[PDB]
Amino acid sequence: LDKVYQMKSKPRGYCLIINNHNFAKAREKVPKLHSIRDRNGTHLDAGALTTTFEELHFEIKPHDDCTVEQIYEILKIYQLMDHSNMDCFICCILSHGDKGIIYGTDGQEAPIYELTSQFTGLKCPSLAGKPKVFFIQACQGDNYQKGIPVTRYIPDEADFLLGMATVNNCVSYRNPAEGTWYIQSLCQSLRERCPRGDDILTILTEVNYEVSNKDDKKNMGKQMPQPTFTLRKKLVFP
């Protein structure tokens, strides 16, 4: 039988949501960001994630409109917490971004690796051997993706799943009336498939399929999400 991460504690763990909507300070402070838009629609992503992961028995921890400094202070608070009685940690970041980074609402940059590496085995021992899941909804550049017709020691960086809304160098999309292509597809697939016992890689493959089928007709644009993982077991949310 396939190895599966333990996933039975109540709660399963914390699910942080860093939900950046108001970019007034970025527009003021950073010259090239003078017209960066407030992220209308992001409330629908936060709401879907909250519902989805509450139903999966996570404890939801929302934080709205975080500067880069505040994001680091929040992740440090969780890095230093005792997760011994938890089975999992999830962090959802909803923001603007560019290649390898996400923006704080002040327009400063936070390298994604600087965020995730706060939860390695050495930095957060009470999460060692437990899945650390990051979902990043941000652009990773400004290119439109084109479309074509058809005991034991384990590594410090083990047990991570990084769900990116897009491949490097390209945009991801937000509909103010709906939420984002990626987070909305992710929650739909989690809600349909977790009750069937499907694992997160199966689910993220479906998210790839669904988001791939959407179109930005005005720019003949597409979006290609991209998971990366160092998971050593099947990840299911019962």
Binding site: N40, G41, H96, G97, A138, A165, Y173, N175, T180, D216
Partner: peptide
């Protein structure tokens, strides 16, 4: 009216 992030 799609918007990029």
């Amino acid at each position: 009216x799609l918007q990029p992030x």
